[PDB]
Design a protein around this motif. Structure first.
Motif, PDB file in Angstrom:
ATOM      1  N   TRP B 228      -5.159  -6.445   9.998  1.00 46.65           N
ATOM      2  CA  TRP B 228      -3.830  -6.836  10.444  1.00 46.65           C
ATOM      3  C   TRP B 228      -3.858  -7.988  11.439  1.00 46.65           C
ATOM      4  N   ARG B 314      -5.635  -3.278   2.956  1.00 46.16           N
ATOM      5  CA  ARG B 314      -4.837  -2.407   3.812  1.00 46.16           C
ATOM      6  C   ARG B 314      -4.471  -1.104   3.113  1.00 46.16           C
ATOM      7  N   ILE B 315      -4.451  -1.101   1.784  1.00 44.55           N
ATOM      8  CA  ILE B 315      -4.075   0.094   1.034  1.00 44.55           C
ATOM      9  C   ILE B 315      -5.295   0.818   0.479  1.00 44.55           C
ATOM     10  N   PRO B 318      -7.828   2.855   3.371  1.00 45.94           N
ATOM     11  CA  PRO B 318      -7.377   4.185   3.819  1.00 45.94           C
ATOM     12  C   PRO B 318      -7.309   5.210   2.700  1.00 45.94           C
TER      13      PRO B 318
HETATM   14  C1  HEX Z   1       1.092  -1.372   3.549  1.00 44.69           C
HETATM   15  C2  HEX Z   1       1.097   0.055   4.090  1.00 44.69           C
HETATM   16  C3  HEX Z   1      -0.283   0.675   3.889  1.00 44.69           C
HETATM   17  C4  HEX Z   1      -0.254   2.143   4.303  1.00 44.69           C
HETATM   18  C5  HEX Z   1      -1.616   2.772   4.021  1.00 44.69           C
HETATM   19  C6  HEX Z   1      -1.561   4.270   4.310  1.00 44.69           C
END
Ligand code: HEX
Ligand code: P9N
Ligand code: P9N
Ligand code: P9N
Ligand code: P9N
Ligand code: P9N
Ligand code: NAG
Ligand code: NAG
Ligand code: NAG
Ligand code: NAG
Ligand code: NAG
Ligand code: NAG
Ligand code: NAG
Ligand code: NAG
Ligand code: NAG
Ligand code: NAG
Ligand code: D10
Ligand code: D10
Ligand code: D10
Ligand code: D10
Ligand code: D10
Ligand code: OCT
Ligand code: OCT
Ligand code: OCT
Ligand code: OCT
Ligand code: OCT
Ligand code: HEX
Ligand code: HEX
Ligand code: HEX
Lengths: 333, 333, 333, 333, 333
Positions: B228, B314-315, B318
């Motif tokens: 980020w 970013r997705i 996680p």
């Molecule tokens: C773009 C939001 C990502 C959220 C990942 C849990």
């Protein structure tokens, strides 16, 4: 020979085949040596005294005064069989000779004394560590003879326990010495009588304050200085936040080295982990500030000071941590 | 003298030259002291009792009741020769005297008791550490006499074992005490009979969660904040990724200090090493982003926002780690 | 009394003043306890048995069968004087009694057994550590009697040694138990006969791979990512190279803590130090790149992309390290 | 009974009330176990032999040859009273029996032997550590009898000491075994005669080179690479200098953990602290360069390449450190 | 037999039933072994001698000279019962035999000697650590006999204590050996007489200077170099200040590892914590400079060199720290 030892068989207790023989006990505590949290035990040195009567040891005299013998005659006469319950290890001092005293009165009264060092277990609780208070006890019981053959009682009640004025512990405060008595039952041998010695311990908080509570507070306040630095210095604020997180983790790890692996949370763990959360949220705070600034620049660019988050963080973060300390120290005093 | 000890030669067992002599055993466990993973052994304190009959110890009486002797007469009569198999070290308490009980009935029945502390080995398995369950046993056998001369059995079957209610371990949960019996064979001496005491242990997971599983998860999430941050801050994102890798390596090293050098992978090692891979891939991810950006600039220059890799990372990152935890905790429960 | 012990003087061996008396030995190994690299010794528990004949212990009987005695009669008859050569410490178990067996046949044959724990030294070599193989031995010899008075030999040759199936070591693999015999000479007392017990040990490599070999390789590959970063980011590449050097130094230091201070280089030291050189050359490589770039800028300025070093380093550095591993693992297998 | 032990009172030495009785001693060293720097002592295992004559032990025979007894007859005859002076702890091996030999000739000559392990103190000097050489000694003296009652001397002079070929130490080289003799005086008991065993030890330097001398040199050379980097990269050169200072401090601290708290400086301390000064001056050097550059810019601004310090530092710093090593290794060789 | 031991009962002291028997004591100190701060005790080895008279041991002679016995006759005659008060553990050396001397004159005078090692507690104070001075004592008292039965006194007053010239400690300086005498009272047994041995210890400050005081001073001076760097280099001065704070925290933590957890502040803690404050204020100083510069730029912008804080800090900060050292070293000398 003054005593007619050879004329009797001392394999049988006095009053054999009849009523029980009363025995009195006196104790003087010399010192407490060490306390172990990992092993949950303590070490004590004391003088143990016994009182009883045996008509087989009578001798004639005109003065009616106690006479003292060298103490190696003990191994040829009847002696009680007391032992320390729930003890881990113990021994009797033997330099330069066995620390044994034997005094016999003309009518047969006998005084017997010993010097022993005993290690005994104590079930401590560390829920309020390091602000905890612990109570431990020492138990004395006869091994072979039940209550129908030997009666065990304190010689002078509450006055039978004495303590040396030099008893001291560097980390603990010793108080409230007293004695009690209770019966014990074994399912396959019978009933026995026990004697108890009780005391209380309280820790000193000075060492833990300087070692754990003060370094933790300073590292948290180091993270707050990043709110007063210009947000355009990205390689300046990121390392500051990250390094404080890692140092806080190191402090948390070092504390647990000296304690047993209990299965519940302690008072010191609450302070350390909440402090870690405060430092962790500081790192996320700048990431939000950096991301929003970049988005705003692109939005303004596509059309062709201090950020509000930093302004509020300067007030909210110090206020929250002060409130936490007020609540934390109000509960644990 | 009540007993005619001097009139017999106690170097021979009762019924010498004939059938075997039955012997019964009773045990009461007092406490378990410590458990060592590196040495793979445990320490136990217990009371051991023996039952047999010897007509040479008979004496006349009218009450028909047990009589107790001081216990130093044991060294002059025949006594069994039990020993603990596969033990490392052991001793008998001797303060203030030998913890020995001797009771003889008029018809010759004898009760003998002892207080001992024994250390015995246990082959533990650490494949599922720290979520493992271990079982250990204690073995009792006669050393000199075979089954043709001495028969060893539990006095009252399943009821011959008792445990103190104060038995407790800070790190383990104790359950399922029971006794069994089995024969043993030695190739050069003959057959013997053994007695077993079995119990089970279960660890507490709270300490390991706070010490290993929680710090590992937080360090992984620290690497995700770099996705980020603006990609033009090269000296800001590179140190963030590198420092988390080194800290994760430190956490991995510290765990192995307290465990033996086994030759198989443990459950905790799987979690730590997969976490290290996640942090390592974070460093390589920015290097790809930086390299592609420089190539694009040169390509556009030679003609005379957020990179797609960052957007997807970013997705995906996680999501993958959450899926790993679901699978990991489903297998090891 | 069955035996006429009081009618003989057992201060003299059987056949005193004549030929030697043969003695046979049997051994059963129970377990191996621990191995120390710093002290170079091992601990073993075993059963030791002796065989001989003494006509002074004969008694009349009609069954012609061995009879067992309680074992405290040993201290009144003649017994061999075996001892363990080159041992550091040892003891005999004595709970609940001395672990001694004595069996005498009608014609005078005697069987004697003991349970002992012995610590003995072993000269280990660590040139190929941790891929080394070690051999150790245990020696048994009579202390007082020479070969002209006592002959020592294995009772049944190769069949005189037995091992328990539960013998196991977490770090080592045990194999090749066998026995040998050799004479010994002392310059001031005479000739003696020795008995040997030999075995071999092999380490497990899994632990050392994960602890030393894998972290070392990853730190080297971390230095290679700097070749793919733009050379204009001076404060980004310099810390990356420096920090990997320091971490590699930490890994090297930690390995030597568990080993004795030998005077030769080990196999693991070769891998660690060559890895340190690879990381060190990475730091010097960027310094050359930075210096040449500055010189070129000044040279072009005074007249009024990817540097070739970086381009070649991406290929040469990975290739050299792969070649080193091929050679290293081919020599040490 | 061959010997008339019961007809004499062995509480008096031979020749009681007359001249002294000569006693000879022989020693064979088996091994040296360990050496402790913090406690300044060593452990040795050896065989001790005594020679004397006692007419009370004569027996008739025709062969005139030595006869061996089981060794438990020692506790009933007169035996010398030798002890080890300045020893910390010691014991006699007793498995499977007391390691005692007793041989008596027909005319009364007696040979007595023992196997003992002794720990004795040694005053070591660490001024030249780790390139030091240490000398230690073991002392033997009679406790009760003075020179007027017992004469102590080596049996065969220089030939009375023997050593096993298996004596070896991993860290030390053993050489120069020899024996001496000297008298001793106690102010309140009289004169005594002592026997000495001397040996010399030399360390191995290989371990300390790789562990201390090589890491220290590399960290110094890491600071020199900053002189070849452009001076405009302030956040690149400052962390390089600072981090090497802290790492050098860590190396200095770790060395002192294994040594006693002496009150003088050692050879290794000189190398470490001079190296720290070299790294420290590197940090101050760039601060001077940065300050002068800023002053020059302001001076030129108010009017409306490589700095000379960096150019000279590239030559002076390597030259000075090389000269220091030449002097340092010339003094300590 | 020269002595008529069998004709007397030695279970009673000389002069039984009458006046007290005088006993003299002589002591020679051999060495001091170790001192522990965490446990607060010391170890000493010494020779202990006793003097008394017993007419039952008289024998006829014409020379009137002392005669020496082997020392195993001690266990059959009356011997005093001295013990060391407030001791933790102790033992008597027994290699190659019990270190016991017994000499009896014709008129019955007896000399008795022993070699013992004793560990005793000492209450140390660490308020001025490491510049502290400690005093400790050793106490000797009779266990069984009171002052009405046994009188204890020094044989020759101040001349009864001797010390070996080889007594030395690496960390402490030993001085002022002297002896005193005092009575003791126990509430349940009576009055006793004690003997004291006193000595003083002083530390060596060299080690602590190099290990703690010098690294602390250098880290403070590292923070002062930031006042001479241009204030526009924000990512250059911020890491310099932060890293020195963290390193200073590490130095503070490492010192407390070797000391007990006392409840008061020590002299070394004052120096370390004041140094931490000096480094901490350096970080806040630049934050004020950076904030004021940004405010001034915005104020001048809205209308459409060296900052004074840096100029004064170069003088005030060095002056304050020098004044602190002058005061600190004037109080603790
Ligand atoms: C773009 C939001 C990502 C959220 C990942 C849990
Ligand atoms: C939108 C925004 O202000 C961003 C800036 C930093 C981001 C967080 C960084 C850490 C986490 C990364 C993860 O990928 C998503 C959740 C987390 C918690 C992020 C949520 C969105 C945040 C808060
Ligand atoms: C093309 C590209 O996106 C680059 C950026 C970082 C690079 C990696 C850096 C680490 C390794 C270096 C090695 O020299 C080659 C393989 C490795 C794994 C590289 C492969 C190519 C990568 C992924
Ligand atoms: C010319 C050049 O490419 C420079 C860049 C880095 C420099 C080296 C830095 C480390 C050393 C410093 C020392 O002062 C001289 C030798 C060493 C090894 C230097 C030699 C010249 C090098 C290689
Ligand atoms: C004039 C100059 O070239 C400056 C640059 C760095 C400065 C030094 C920085 C460290 C010290 C700071 C202290 O405040 C004064 C002395 C010290 C030693 C300074 C003296 C003046 C120096 C050398
Ligand atoms: C106005 C000013 O010169 C600022 C710069 C750094 C700031 C300090 C940073 C650390 C603390 C942060 C906290 O939020 C408020 C108090 C503290 C102590 C701040 C007070 C105001 C200071 C001194
Ligand atoms: C100290 C004490 O109690 N002494 C008494 C004494 O008073 C009494 O006259 C005597 C009679 O036998 O018994 C004893
Ligand atoms: C602290 C304690 O146990 N005190 C008791 C007290 O309660 C009791 O009244 C007294 C008389 O027996 O003995 C004592
Ligand atoms: C407790 C017990 O069993 N006592 C018995 C008693 O009932 C019986 O009368 C006696 C006969 O000798 O033997 C015994
Ligand atoms: C846990 C265990 O061993 N239980 C046994 C049980 O199975 C058996 O039926 C009983 C009767 O012998 O003894 C007990
Ligand atoms: C087991 C064994 O060998 N027993 C023998 C037996 O066969 C033989 O008849 C006897 C003669 O005395 O000696 C014994
Ligand atoms: C491994 C070993 O030592 N084996 C020997 C073997 O070589 C020999 O042939 C046999 C007969 O004595 O004894 C065994
Ligand atoms: C080995 C030795 O010295 N033996 C001698 C022998 O030669 C001599 O004849 C004998 C006389 O009693 O004394 C012995
Ligand atoms: C190293 C040593 O002590 N050597 C001595 C030697 O000097 C002496 O000449 C010889 C004769 O007694 O004894 C030996
Ligand atoms: C050394 C010493 O004091 N010796 C004396 C001696 O002088 C005296 O003649 C003798 C009388 O029995 O007593 C003894
Ligand atoms: C240091 C010390 O205790 N010295 C004393 C001294 O004061 C006293 O005058 C002398 C005579 O008893 O004994 C000694
Ligand atoms: C850092 C703020 C600390 C505040 C402590 C307040 C203690 C109140 C106890 C009732
Ligand atoms: C960080 C995400 C952790 C998710 C844990 C889920 C546990 C499920 C157990 C079945
Ligand atoms: C990092 C590359 C490792 C290569 C290992 C090859 C092993 C070959 C053994 C013959
Ligand atoms: C780093 C330079 C080392 C030079 C060593 C020279 C040794 C000379 C010994 C006489
Ligand atoms: C860093 C300045 C140190 C000054 C020390 C002065 C000592 C004076 C003792 C009276
Ligand atoms: C600490 C969080 C503050 C958020 C403020 C948001 C104002 C728009
Ligand atoms: C995590 C890797 C994502 C790669 C996306 C590539 C899109 C072109
Ligand atoms: C790894 C060193 C490569 C040097 C290449 C030089 C090309 C001019
Ligand atoms: C290492 C210090 C060099 C100083 C050179 C100064 C030249 C003007
Ligand atoms: C060290 C603080 C100095 C402050 C000076 C302020 C001058 C306006
Ligand atoms: C803006 C001032 C904040 C003060 C917080 C205590
Ligand atoms: C340019 C590609 C290099 C690959 C090295 C293995
Ligand atoms: C400006 C010079 C300052 C010197 C401080 C000692």
């Amino acid at each position: 020979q003054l005593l007619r030892i050879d004329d009797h068989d001392f394999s049988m207790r006095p009053g054999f085949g009849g009523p029980a023989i009363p025995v009195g006990v006196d104790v003087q505590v010399e010192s407490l040596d060490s306390i172990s949290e990992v092993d949950m035990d303590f070490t004590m040195t004391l003088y143990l005294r016994h009182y009883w009567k045996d008509e087989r040891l009578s001798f004639p005299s005109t003065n009616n005064l106690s006479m003292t013998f060298d103490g190696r005659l003990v191994k040829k006469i009847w002696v009680p069989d007391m032992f320390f319950v729930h003890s881990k290890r113990s021994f009797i001092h033997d330099t330069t000779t066995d620390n044994v005293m034997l005094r016999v009165q003309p009518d047969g009264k006998v005084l017997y004394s010993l010097r022993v060092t005993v290690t005994a277990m104590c079930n401590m609780d560390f829920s309020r560590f390091p602000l905890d208070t612990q109570t431990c006890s020492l138990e004395i019981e006869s091994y072979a003879y039940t209550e129908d053959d030997l009666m065990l009682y304190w010689k002078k009640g509450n006055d039978s326990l004495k303590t040396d004025e030099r008893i001291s512990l560097s980390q603990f405060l010793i108080q409230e010495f007293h004695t009690t008595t209770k019966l014990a039952f074994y399912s396959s041998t019978g009933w026995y009588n026990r004697l108890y010695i009780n005391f209380t311990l309280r820790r000193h908080i000075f060492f833990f304050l300087l070692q754990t509570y003060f370094p933790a507070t300073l590292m948290v306040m180091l993270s707050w200085v990043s709110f007063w630095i210009d947000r355009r210095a990205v390689p300046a604020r990121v390392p500051l936040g990250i390094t404080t997180v890692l140092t806080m983790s190191t402090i948390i790890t070092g504390v647990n080295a000296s304690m047993p692996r209990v299965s519940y949370i302690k008072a010191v763990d609450i302070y350390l982990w909440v402090s870690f959360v405060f430092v962790f949220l500081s790192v996320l705070e700048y990431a939000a500030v950096n991301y929003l600034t970049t988005v705003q620049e692109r939005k303004e660019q596509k059309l062709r000071d201090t950020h509000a988050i930093d302004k509020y963080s300067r007030i909210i973060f110090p206020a929250a941590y002060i409130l936490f300390n007020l609540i934390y120290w109000s509960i644990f005093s």
